[PDB]
Motif scaffolding. Structure first.
Motif, PDB file in Angstrom:
ATOM      1  N   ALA A   6      35.268  37.645  57.561  1.00 43.66           N
ATOM      2  CA  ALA A   6      34.748  38.317  56.383  1.00 43.66           C
ATOM      3  C   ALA A   6      34.837  37.364  55.149  1.00 43.66           C
ATOM      4  O   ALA A   6      35.829  36.688  54.958  1.00 43.66           O
ATOM      5  N   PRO A   7      33.778  37.296  54.346  1.00 40.61           N
ATOM      6  CA  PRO A   7      33.884  36.525  53.127  1.00 40.61           C
ATOM      7  C   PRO A   7      34.736  37.269  52.064  1.00 40.61           C
ATOM      8  O   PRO A   7      35.019  38.456  52.133  1.00 40.61           O
ATOM      9  N   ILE A   8      35.163  36.515  51.088  1.00 40.31           N
ATOM     10  CA  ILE A   8      35.986  37.002  50.038  1.00 40.31           C
ATOM     11  C   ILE A   8      35.022  37.269  48.866  1.00 40.31           C
ATOM     12  O   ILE A   8      34.040  36.559  48.702  1.00 40.31           O
ATOM     13  N   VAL A   9      35.332  38.294  48.082  1.00 43.33           N
ATOM     14  CA  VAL A   9      34.612  38.628  46.874  1.00 43.33           C
ATOM     15  C   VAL A   9      35.602  38.794  45.745  1.00 43.33           C
ATOM     16  O   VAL A   9      36.549  39.563  45.837  1.00 43.33           O
ATOM     17  N   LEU A  10      35.360  38.039  44.667  1.00 44.60           N
ATOM     18  CA  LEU A  10      36.234  37.981  43.492  1.00 44.60           C
ATOM     19  C   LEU A  10      35.810  39.003  42.456  1.00 44.60           C
ATOM     20  O   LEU A  10      34.614  39.082  42.139  1.00 44.60           O
ATOM     21  N   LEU A  11      36.768  39.727  41.892  1.00 44.10           N
ATOM     22  CA  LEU A  11      36.449  40.831  40.965  1.00 44.10           C
ATOM     23  C   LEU A  11      37.396  40.853  39.796  1.00 44.10           C
ATOM     24  O   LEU A  11      38.595  41.090  39.965  1.00 44.10           O
ATOM     25  N   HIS A  12      36.812  40.668  38.599  1.00 42.80           N
ATOM     26  CA  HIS A  12      37.551  40.614  37.341  1.00 42.80           C
ATOM     27  C   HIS A  12      38.016  41.976  36.745  1.00 42.80           C
ATOM     28  O   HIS A  12      37.604  43.043  37.234  1.00 42.80           O
ATOM     29  N   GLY A  13      38.786  41.913  35.632  1.00 42.75           N
ATOM     30  CA  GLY A  13      39.306  43.101  34.936  1.00 42.75           C
ATOM     31  C   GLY A  13      38.483  43.569  33.743  1.00 42.75           C
ATOM     32  O   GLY A  13      37.261  43.549  33.800  1.00 42.75           O
ATOM     33  N   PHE A  14      39.152  43.963  32.653  1.00 43.91           N
ATOM     34  CA  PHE A  14      38.497  44.358  31.417  1.00 43.91           C
ATOM     35  C   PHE A  14      38.017  43.195  30.599  1.00 43.91           C
ATOM     36  O   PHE A  14      37.361  43.403  29.570  1.00 43.91           O
ATOM     37  N   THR A  15      38.311  41.952  31.002  1.00 46.79           N
ATOM     38  CA  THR A  15      37.362  40.906  30.592  1.00 46.79           C
ATOM     39  C   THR A  15      36.830  40.298  31.866  1.00 46.79           C
ATOM     40  O   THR A  15      37.416  40.502  32.967  1.00 46.79           O
ATOM     41  N   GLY A  16      35.724  39.575  31.729  1.00 51.75           N
ATOM     42  CA  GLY A  16      35.098  38.930  32.876  1.00 51.75           C
ATOM     43  C   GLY A  16      33.601  38.774  32.800  1.00 51.75           C
ATOM     44  O   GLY A  16      32.934  39.564  32.130  1.00 51.75           O
ATOM     45  N   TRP A  17      33.061  37.775  33.504  1.00 44.28           N
ATOM     46  CA  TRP A  17      31.654  37.417  33.387  1.00 44.28           C
ATOM     47  C   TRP A  17      31.219  36.587  34.586  1.00 44.28           C
ATOM     48  O   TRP A  17      32.061  36.008  35.258  1.00 44.28           O
ATOM     49  N   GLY A  18      29.925  36.493  34.814  1.00 46.65           N
ATOM     50  CA  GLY A  18      29.349  35.733  35.910  1.00 46.65           C
ATOM     51  C   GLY A  18      29.555  34.234  35.787  1.00 46.65           C
ATOM     52  O   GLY A  18      29.830  33.665  34.676  1.00 46.65           O
ATOM     53  N   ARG A  19      29.305  33.565  36.910  1.00 46.25           N
ATOM     54  CA  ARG A  19      29.357  32.097  36.990  1.00 46.25           C
ATOM     55  C   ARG A  19      28.424  31.379  36.003  1.00 46.25           C
ATOM     56  O   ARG A  19      28.733  30.239  35.613  1.00 46.25           O
ATOM     57  N   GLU A  20      27.327  32.019  35.569  1.00 48.25           N
ATOM     58  CA  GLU A  20      26.428  31.337  34.567  1.00 48.25           C
ATOM     59  C   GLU A  20      26.770  31.729  33.161  1.00 48.25           C
ATOM     60  O   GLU A  20      26.156  31.188  32.187  1.00 48.25           O
ATOM     61  N   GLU A  21      27.689  32.685  32.986  1.00 46.16           N
ATOM     62  CA  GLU A  21      27.956  33.100  31.604  1.00 46.16           C
ATOM     63  C   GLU A  21      29.053  32.204  31.036  1.00 46.16           C
ATOM     64  O   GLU A  21      29.619  31.409  31.766  1.00 46.16           O
ATOM     65  N   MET A  22      29.313  32.328  29.731  1.00 47.55           N
ATOM     66  CA  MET A  22      30.365  31.556  29.055  1.00 47.55           C
ATOM     67  C   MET A  22      30.123  30.064  29.199  1.00 47.55           C
ATOM     68  O   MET A  22      31.087  29.274  29.315  1.00 47.55           O
ATOM     69  N   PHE A  23      28.837  29.679  29.218  1.00 44.55           N
ATOM     70  CA  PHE A  23      28.460  28.285  29.475  1.00 44.55           C
ATOM     71  C   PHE A  23      29.122  27.702  30.763  1.00 44.55           C
ATOM     72  O   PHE A  23      29.429  26.514  30.859  1.00 44.55           O
ATOM     73  N   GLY A  24      29.442  28.562  31.719  1.00 42.65           N
ATOM     74  CA  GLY A  24      30.099  28.107  32.962  1.00 42.65           C
ATOM     75  C   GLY A  24      31.615  27.958  33.000  1.00 42.65           C
ATOM     76  O   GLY A  24      32.183  27.621  34.051  1.00 42.65           O
ATOM     77  N   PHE A  25      32.303  28.218  31.899  1.00 38.92           N
ATOM     78  CA  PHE A  25      33.761  28.342  31.955  1.00 38.92           C
ATOM     79  C   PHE A  25      34.085  29.556  32.879  1.00 38.92           C
ATOM     80  O   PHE A  25      33.611  30.679  32.661  1.00 38.92           O
ATOM     81  N   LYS A  26      34.843  29.318  33.923  1.00 41.80           N
ATOM     82  CA  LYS A  26      35.105  30.381  34.968  1.00 41.80           C
ATOM     83  C   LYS A  26      36.226  31.338  34.591  1.00 41.80           C
ATOM     84  O   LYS A  26      37.338  30.894  34.275  1.00 41.80           O
ATOM     85  N   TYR A  27      35.960  32.650  34.633  1.00 37.09           N
ATOM     86  CA  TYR A  27      37.058  33.625  34.592  1.00 37.09           C
ATOM     87  C   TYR A  27      38.061  33.307  35.719  1.00 37.09           C
ATOM     88  O   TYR A  27      39.287  33.341  35.533  1.00 37.09           O
ATOM     89  N   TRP A  28      37.538  33.000  36.883  1.00 35.96           N
ATOM     90  CA  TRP A  28      38.381  32.728  38.051  1.00 35.96           C
ATOM     91  C   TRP A  28      38.668  31.220  38.114  1.00 35.96           C
ATOM     92  O   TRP A  28      38.081  30.458  38.928  1.00 35.96           O
ATOM     93  N   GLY A  29      39.601  30.814  37.279  1.00 35.17           N
ATOM     94  CA  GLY A  29      40.100  29.445  37.276  1.00 35.17           C
ATOM     95  C   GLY A  29      40.293  28.914  35.845  1.00 35.17           C
ATOM     96  O   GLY A  29      41.159  28.070  35.644  1.00 35.17           O
ATOM     97  N   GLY A  30      39.494  29.430  34.890  1.00 35.82           N
ATOM     98  CA  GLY A  30      39.546  29.092  33.452  1.00 35.82           C
ATOM     99  C   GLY A  30      39.781  27.601  33.266  1.00 35.82           C
ATOM    100  O   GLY A  30      38.990  26.788  33.728  1.00 35.82           O
ATOM    101  N   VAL A  31      40.904  27.247  32.642  1.00 34.22           N
ATOM    102  CA  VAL A  31      41.121  25.825  32.324  1.00 34.22           C
ATOM    103  C   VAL A  31      41.574  25.010  33.501  1.00 34.22           C
ATOM    104  O   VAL A  31      41.543  23.808  33.404  1.00 34.22           O
ATOM    105  N   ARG A  32      42.026  25.644  34.601  1.00 30.13           N
ATOM    106  CA  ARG A  32      42.503  24.906  35.770  1.00 30.13           C
ATOM    107  C   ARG A  32      41.366  24.486  36.678  1.00 30.13           C
ATOM    108  O   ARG A  32      41.563  23.703  37.582  1.00 30.13           O
TER     109      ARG A  32
END
Ligand SMILES: [Ca+2]
Ligand SMILES: [Cl-]
Ligand code: NA
Ligand SMILES: [Zn+2]
Length: 386
Positions: A6-32
Motif C-alpha cells: 500500500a502507498p503512503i498518503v501524507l495529511l497535514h493539520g490546521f496549517t498545510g498546503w500542496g507541493r506547488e503551494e508556498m513556492f514549493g516549501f514543503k509542509y512535510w519537511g519544511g527547512v529539513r
C-alpha cells in the motif's frame, strides 16, 4: 520484512498546503527537506494530500476522499443545508483510482490531520445515516462516501494529533494568536503576510464558503476577514473540532475500524517548573510556541472539566496527553507498543522530545533525525500484514 504494497498518503493539520503551494516549501519537511521525496527514493511510494486547513474535519474528509478516488468534492446535501455552504467543492483527477478496485493506503497524518484521517475511515466503514435519509427524503443524489460498506485505509498513523482536543483553544485572544500562528508559519516558509501576492501562494480551499483571497489583498487583511467569516465562527470548522469540547463530540461517533491499524506518536517539548509543577517551553522550541502558546498550555487547568496536571506537558501547540489516541467520549482501545502491531486498536508508539513544528521539519532541530524517523515509520508500515 515487507508484507503489503500500500502507498503512503501524507495529511497535514490546521496549517498545510500542496507541493506547488508556498513556492514549493514543503509542509512535510519544511527547512529539513522533502519527506515525500525521501520515502519515494527509498522505494516507499508516497503521495501528499491538501485539504482546507481551517475547515471542519468532515469537510476535509470529503475533500480527501475526492482527491484520492477522483471526482468532485461532495459535502453531503444534509450537511451543506444545515451549515449554509455549497454541497459541491472542487474537482480532482484522483491520485489513486485503484482504491475503487481494491487498492489501499497507509495514511500518515500530523496534528488535526489525525482527526480527519479517523473520520475518513469512519465515513468509509459506516457512511452517514443522516445523509442517507436526507437523500431519500429530498430525492437528491448521494456520495458513495455516505453509503458505508467501503474500506481502503489499511493504517492511520497520527503524529502530535489532538485526539482529545487542545486547551490552546481556551486561551484569551485565541483568535488573534491562532492567525498569528498562521503568519509565523508563512514566515518560516519565507512568505510575507503584508504583501498582496498575485500568485495564490496559500489557498485556504474555501470554495464551499465562497471565500477567496482577493486581487490586491495581503494575508494580514485576508486573515482579518477570515476571523469574521463562517470558517472561523461556525461549529463547522477546524476551530470547533480542535477544542476539548468539539474533539469529544467527534470521538462520540468516529471510532476505530476493526479493519485498520492505528499508530499514535506523541510529542513533548516542555519541562516541569519547581514552583507548582507547571510546564514551560524547553530551549529550541519554535519561537512562536515558546512565547505565545507553551506558557498557557503548561499552566491552564480546569479540575471540573477534566483538565488537571496530566494536561500540562505539551509540544507547544497540543497537550501531550491528547495525542496517544481518543479517550474522552471514546470507546477506542489504546495499548502501548509491545513490538507487534494490532489491528483495530491504537498502538501508542511512544513520546518524542520534539515540538509540534519540529516533527515535520518546519522548525529546525538538529538533534532530531527526521529522515531516519520517517523512514523507520515507512518500513514498519510496509511490514504490516494486510
Ligand atoms: Ca527547534
Ligand atoms: Cl471572498
Ligand atoms: Na498544522
Ligand atoms: Zn461543512
Amino acid at each position: 520484512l515487507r508484507a503489503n504494497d500500500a502507498p503512503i498518503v501524507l495529511l497535514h493539520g490546521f496549517t498545510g498546503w500542496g507541493r506547488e503551494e508556498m513556492f514549493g516549501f514543503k509542509y512535510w519537511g519544511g527547512v529539513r527537506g522533502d519527506i515525500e521525496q525521501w520515502l519515494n527514493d527509498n522505494g516507499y511510494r508516497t503521495y501528499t494530500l491538501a485539504v482546507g486547513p481551517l475547515s471542519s474535519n468532515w469537510d476535509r474528509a470529503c475533500e480527501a476522499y475526492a482527491q484520492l478516488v477522483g471526482g468532485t468534492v461532495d459535502y453531503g446535501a444534509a450537511h451543506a443545508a444545515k451549515h449554509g455552504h455549497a454541497r459541491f467543492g472542487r474537482t480532482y483527477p484522483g491520485l489513486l483510482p485503484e482504491l475503487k478496485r481494491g487498492g489501499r493506503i497507509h495514511i500518515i497524518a500530523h496534528s488535526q490531520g489525525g482527526q480527519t484521517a479517523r473520520m475518513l475511515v469512519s465515513l468509509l466503514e459506516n457512511g452517514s445515516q443522516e445523509e442517507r435519509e436526507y437523500a431519500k427524503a429530498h430525492n437528491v443524489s448521494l456520495s458513495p462516501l455516505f453509503e458505508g460498506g467501503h474500506h481502503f485505509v489499511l493504517s492511520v498513523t497520527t503524529i502530535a494529533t489532538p485526539h482529545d482536543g487542545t486547551t490552546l483553544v481556551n486561551m484569551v485572544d485565541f483568535t488573534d494568536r491562532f492567525f498569528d500562528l498562521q503568519k509565523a508559519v508563512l514566515e518560516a516558509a519565507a512568505v510575507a503576510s503584508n504583501v498582496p501576492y498575485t500568485s495564490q501562494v496559500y489557498d485556504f480551499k474555501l470554495d464551499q464558503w465562497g471565500l477567496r483571497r482577493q486581487p490586491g489583498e495581503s494575508f494580514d487583511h485576508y486573515f482579518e476577514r477570515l476571523k469574521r467569516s463562517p470558517v472561523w465562527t461556525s461549529t463547522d470548522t477546524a476551530r470547533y473540532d480542535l477544542s476539548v469540547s468539539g474533539a469529544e463530540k467527534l470521538n462520540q461517533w468516529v471510532q476505530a475500524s476493526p479493519n485498520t491499524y492505528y499508530l499514535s506518536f506523541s510529542t513533548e517539548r516542555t519541562y516541569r517548573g519547581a514552583l507548582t509543577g507547571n510546564h514551560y517551553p524547553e530551549l529550541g522550541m519554535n519561537a512562536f510556541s515558546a512565547v505565545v502558546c507553551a506558557p498557557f498550555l503548561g499552566s491552564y487547568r480546569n479540575p471540573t472539566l477534566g483538565i488537571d496536571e496530566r494536561w500540562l506537558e505539551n509540544d507547544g501547540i497540543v497537550n501531550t496527553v491528547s495525542m496517544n489516541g481518543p479517550k474522552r467520549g471514546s470507546s477506542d482501545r489504546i495499548v502501548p507498543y509491545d513490538g507487534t502491531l494490532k489491528k483495530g486498536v491504537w498502538n501508542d508508539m511512544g513520546t518524542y522530545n520534539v515540538d509540534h513544528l519540529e516533527i515535520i521539519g518546519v522548525d529546525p532541530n538538529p538533534s532530531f533525525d527526521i529522515r531516519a524517523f520517517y523512514l523507520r515509520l515507512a518500513e514498519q508500515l510496509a511490514s504490516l500484514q494486510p
